[PDB]
Design a protein around this ligand. Structure first.
Ligand SMILES: O=C(O)[C@H]1O[C@H](O[C@@H]2[C@H](O)[C@@H](O)[C@@H](O[C@@H]3[C@H](O)[C@@H](O)[C@@H](O[C@@H]4[C@H](O)[C@@H](O)[C@@H](O)O[C@@H]4C(=O)O)O[C@@H]3C(=O)O)O[C@@H]2C(=O)O)[C@H](O)[C@@H](O)[C@H]1O
Length: 542
C-alpha cells in the first residue's frame, strides 16, 4: 500500500528526526534534515564553529499536512497528535509577545539547546516567503495564539497602512498598531516606498489574513487580504495583462556609483540594469523572469484560486483576475514548440537570449537570459485554472508541459484523444498533484491511472533508506518532502475522501544566513536549500 509506505516514512521521521539531545525528556520538535543512511541531523555552523541542529517550523508545514492527512486516512491519531504537540510547543516557547514565531527565513530553533537562533546577523527578523503554514492545524490547537501570530505578522510587515507599503521583513517585539482599522488611500501603480512588496511575502500576508477570516469571521482581515491582492492586480500591464512581482518601486535615497552594488536604496534595480535600453517600463515588479514567475503564476495562483472558490460570490473577482494572469502568461511567454517560458518584461518585451550589458541585480554582465522549461508546478496551475475556465489556451499549456515531461498526450481536450504514457518513468510529485487535479475536474480515468503510475515511480525511485529524496546521491533528506503529500492526495482520491488531505498550495520553508566554512570563513547568504542539494562527498563552495 502507498498508505503503508507513508506511515512507515512518518514513523521514520519521528524516530530519526526527533530530539535526541535531552535524554528521556525530549521536546516534540523535529530536525528539518536527516541523512537517511546514518540518521545524522542537518546542522547549521555558526561563526565560532558551534553547530546547531536546524529545526525551522516554517520548513515543516508540508510535513504537518502529511501527518494530519496520514491520521485521517489511516485512522491512527498518533500523527495528528504529534503535529498538535509540535504546534503547542511553539506557541508555548517560541512565540514572542508580539505574536511572531521564531521561524522563517532568518530564525529557527536549535534542537540541541532548544534556543532560538539567528543565522543572519543583520537580519534577526521575521520572514515568510511562499511559506503557506498550516494555519488550519494551528487554529485547532490554539486559536488565540494563531490569531495573535497572523495579526502580529501584518503589524510587523505593513510599514505604512495608509498606502499599504509592505515588507518582506518584520521586526520582533513591536506593539500592536491600528491594524485593520487603519485608514487607506489607494496609490497609483509603482509608487516609491522603502518597503519591498515582493509577492512571495505578499502571498503569505494574503493567505494568513484569509485564514483568520475563515476561522474567526474577521472582516477586517478579509478586507485587507483582498485589498492586498488588489495591489498586485492594479499595476498589471494595461495591454498584455502580465505582472506583477511587486507593486511598489524602491525609494531612491542615494545615487549609485557601482552597478554591482544592488542595495534597494539606490532605486529600482531593474530600472538600473535595463532602463538604459528598455525605458521606464523596466521596473522590478515587471520583470517576468524565472523564479519570479513561479511566485506569481504558481504559488500566488494556487492560493488565490482556492481562496476565490472559498469566498463564493465575493471571490469571483479574485478568480477572474487569477485566471486572467495565467492566460496572459500563456499568451505571451509560453512557447508550445519546446515547452519553455520566455523571460520577459510585463509590457510584452521578449528577453529571450538577451545578453546583460552591465552588472546588476539580475546577473553579471554577459549573462544570457534563456527561455526556461515549464515545470510540473505550472501543470498544476494550468490544470486548476482550466477547471474554473475551460479555455483551450490554458489546456494548451497543460498539454505541452505533460508531453514534455514524458507523461504522453493528455488529449486535445479533457477526455478527447487521450494517449497518456502508462510506461512513464516520471516521479515528480508535482506531476502527480496535477494529474489528480485533471482527474477531479474531468473524471477521466486515464488521468488517475497515470497518477497511480507516478506514485509507484515515487516509491520505486525516491523512497530510499526510509526517507524521500530527489536523487539517491543526496546527502540529506528533507522531512518536508512533498512526495508523501502527493501519495496521500492520491490515496485520498482513490478512497473518495479528498478533503482528508489539506489543499496543496506549493508552500515550503527556507533558512538563510552566514554559514561557517571549514577554513573558518563566512559563506554569506547560505540557504538550507543549498545543503539539501549536496550529494555525498560534496561541500558548499565559496
Ligand atoms: O534566484 C533568484 O533570483 C532569487 O529570487 C528571489 O530572491 C530575491 C533575491 O535574489 C534575494 O537575494 C532576496 O533579495 C532582497 C533584496 O532585493 C536584496 O537587495 C537584499 O536586501 C538587502 C539586504 O541584504 C537586506 O538585509 C536589507 O538590508 O535590505 C537590503 C536592500 O537591498 O534593501 O536581500 C533581500 C532579501 O533577502 O529579501 O530576495 C529576493 C526576493 O525576491 O525575495 C527568490 O526568493 C529566491 O529564492 C531566488 O529565486
Amino acid at each position: 500500500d502507498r498508505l503503508t509506505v507513508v506511515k512507515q516514512y512518518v514513523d521514520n521521521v519521528l524516530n530519526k528526526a526527533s530530539d535526541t539531545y535531552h535524554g528521556d525528556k525530549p521536546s516534540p520538535l523535529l530536525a528539518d534534515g536527516v541523512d537517511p543512511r546514518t540518521g545524522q541531523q542537518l546542522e547549521w555552523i555558526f561563526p565560532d564553529g558551534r553547530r546547531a541542529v536546524l529545526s525551522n517550523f516554517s520548513a515543516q508545514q508540508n510535513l504537518m499536512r502529511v501527518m494530519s492527512g496520514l491520521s485521517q486516512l489511516s485512522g491512527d491519531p498518533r500523527y495528528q497528535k504529534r503535529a498538535e504537540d509540535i504546534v503547542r510547543y511553539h506557541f508555548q516557547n517560541y512565540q514572542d509577545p508580539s505574536g511572531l514565531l521564531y521561524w522563517g527565513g532568518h530564525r529557527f530553533v536549535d534542537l540541541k539547546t532548544l534556543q532560538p537562533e539567528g543565522p543572519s546577523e543583520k537580519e534577526r527578523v521575521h520572514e515568510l516567503k511562499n511559506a503557506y503554514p498550516y494555519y488550519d492545524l494551528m487554529f485547532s490547537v490554539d486559536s488565540d495564539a494563531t490569531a495573535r501570530f497572523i495579526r502580529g505578522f501584518w503589524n510587523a510587515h505593513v510599514y505604512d497602512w495608509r498606502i499599504l507599503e509592505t515588507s518582506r521583513h518584520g521586526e520582533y517585539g513591536k506593539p500592536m498598531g491600528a491594524l485593520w482599522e487603519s485608514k487607506f488611500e489607494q496609490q497609483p501603480p509603482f509608487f516609491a516606498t522603502k518597503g519591498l512588496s515582493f509577492l512571495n511575502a505578499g502571498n503569505d500576508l494574503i493567505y494568513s489574513a484569509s485564514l483568520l477570516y475563515q476561522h474567526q469571521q474577521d472582516q477586517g482581515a478579509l478586507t485587507w487580504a483582498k485589498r492586498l491582492a488588489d495591489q498586485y492586480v492594479l499595476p498589471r500591464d494595461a495591454k498584455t495583462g502580465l505582472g506583477v512581482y511587486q507593486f511598489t518601486q524602491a525609494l531612491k535615497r542615494e545615487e549609485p556609483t557601482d552597478d554591482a552594488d544592488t542595495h534597494s536604496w539606490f532605486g529600482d534595480r531593474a530600472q538600473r540594469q535595463f532602463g538604459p535600453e528598455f525605458g521606464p517600463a523596466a521596473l522590478e515588479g515587471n520583470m517576468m523572469l524565472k523564479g519570479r514567475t513561479s511566485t506569481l503564476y504558481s504559488e500566488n495562483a494556487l492560493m488565490q484560486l482556492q481562496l476565490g472558490k472559498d469566498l463564493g460570490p465575493q471571490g469571483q473577482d479574485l478568480l477572474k483576475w487569477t485566471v486572467d494572469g495565467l492566460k496572459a502568461f500563456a499568451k505571451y511567454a509560453y512557447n508550445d514548440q519546446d515547452n519553455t517560458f520566455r523571460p520577459m518584461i510585463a509590457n510584452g518585451q521578449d528577453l529571450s537570449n538577451y545578453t546583460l550589458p552591465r552588472d546588476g541585480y539580475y546577473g553579471k554582465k554577459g549573462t544570457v537570459l534563456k527561455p526556461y522549461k515549464a515545470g510540473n508546478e505550472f501543470l498544476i496551475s494550468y490544470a486548476r485554472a482550466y477547471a474554473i475556465d475551460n479555455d483551450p489556451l490554458l489546456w494548451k499549456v497543460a498539454r505541452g508541459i505533460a508531453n514534455d515531461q514524458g507523461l504522453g498526450d493528455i488529449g486535445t481536450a479533457p477526455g478527447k484523444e487521450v494517449k497518456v504514457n502508462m510506461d512513464t518513468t516520471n516521479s515528480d510529485p508535482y506531476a502527480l498533484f496535477a494529474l489528480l487535479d485533471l482527474y477531479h475536474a474531468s473524471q477521466v480515468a486515464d488521468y488517475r491511472k497515470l497518477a497511480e503510475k507516478i506514485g509507484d515511480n515515487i516509491i520505486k525511485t525516491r523512497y530510499i533508506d526510509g526517507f524521500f529524496m530527489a536523487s539517491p546521491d543526496r546527502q540529506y533528506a528533507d522531512v518536508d518532502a512533498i512526495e508523501p503529500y502527493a501519495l496521500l492526495a492520491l490515496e485520498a482520491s482513490l478512497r473518495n475522501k479528498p478533503q482528508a488531505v489539506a489543499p496543496f498550495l506549493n508552500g515550503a520553508g527556507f533558512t538563510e544566513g552566514a554559514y561557517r566554512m571549514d577554513d573558518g570563513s563566512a559563506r554569506v547568504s547560505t540557504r538550507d536549500n543549498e545543503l539539501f542539494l549536496l550529494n555525498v562527498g560534496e561541500k558548499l563552495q565559496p
